[PDB]
Design a binder for this molecule. Structure first.
Ligand SMILES: [Cl-]
Length: 269
């Protein structure tokens, strides 16, 4: 079952989509995953990657919530006002939403994030005791403010300082709040607070987010939980465009989740 949902965050509506397993009995409760999209992404994500990921997770027995951050997709708000802390607010609200569903096991909720959404996932997991596992795809874990500004002309940076929304490419505009707070929390600085299982998947041909950041992240957390894993997708680009890479990412994610024993369909009988 797939159905649209809405909830409020920071005074504004978020629209999302909820995947519910069809074999979920009346009293039964399922583990759940909230999925966080990337920068200038939406809840379907590139070449519908999140749709495919969510369908596979739901087939595996998870309730899955995908939603548009405020300022993205069909949620309220303007993109130029978006900030990473604002997306952490939204992300926490999506956990609230899953926690209040009577067919979700409130003690078996985890998160999945792609790139900037992986940044959000890591930040939220460093704080939120409700998160029981973290899945990071192509995650942006390192400082980004300087790299973002280095892509802008000096006169554009001044206009940003003066309060203008400036063009950042492909028709997307951004105000300074994003640049001021994208490094308020840098994930590498708080990764050692995450003690639940973390799966890091990163392509060795990612031209957007260097693999180096995923390697550093794994180095920090590898012995904090003996289920933590780093999977490097050989030939994989930032959003796993080649079909075989998308399949590999999904297969590795399902396999890893199996190791955590979150679903027990045999016992469900
Ligand atoms: Cl905000």
């Amino acid at each position: 079952m797939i159905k649209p949902v809405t909830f409020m965050s920071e005074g504004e509506q978020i629209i999302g989509v909820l995947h519910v397993p069809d074999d979920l009995r009346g009293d039964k409760r399922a583990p759940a995953i909230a999925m966080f999209h990337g920068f200038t992404g939406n809840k379907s994500e590139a070449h519908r990657l999140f749709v495919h990921v969510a369908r596979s997770l739901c087939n595996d027995g998870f309730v899955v919530l995908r939603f548009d951050f405020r300022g993205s997709g069909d949620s309220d708000g303007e993109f130029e006002d978006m900030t990473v802390p604002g997306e952490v607010c939204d992300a926490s609200r999506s956990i609230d939403f899953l926690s209040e569903l009577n067919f979700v096991d409130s003690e078996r909720i985890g998160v999945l994030g792609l790139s900037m959404g992986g940044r959000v996932a890591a930040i939220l997991a460093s704080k939120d005791r409700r998160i029981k596992f973290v899945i990071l795809y192509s995650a942006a874990l390192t400082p980004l403010r300087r790299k973002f500004l280095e892509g802008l002309e000096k006169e554009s940076i001044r206009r940003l300082e003066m309060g203008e929304a400036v063009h950042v490419g492909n028709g997307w505009y951004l105000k300074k709040g994003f640049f001021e707070t994208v490094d308020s929390i840098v994930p590498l600085d708080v990764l050692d607070r995450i003690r639940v299982p973390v799966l890091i998947i990163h392509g060795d041909s990612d031209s957007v987010i260097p693999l180096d950041g995923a390697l550093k992240g794994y180095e920090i957390i590898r012995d904090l939980n003996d289920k933590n894993e780093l999977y490097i997708v050989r030939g994989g680009d930032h959003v796993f465009t080649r079909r075989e890479h998308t399949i590999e990412v999904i297969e590795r994610t399902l396999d890893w989740l199996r190791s955590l024993n979150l679903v027990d369909k045999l016992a469900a009988a």
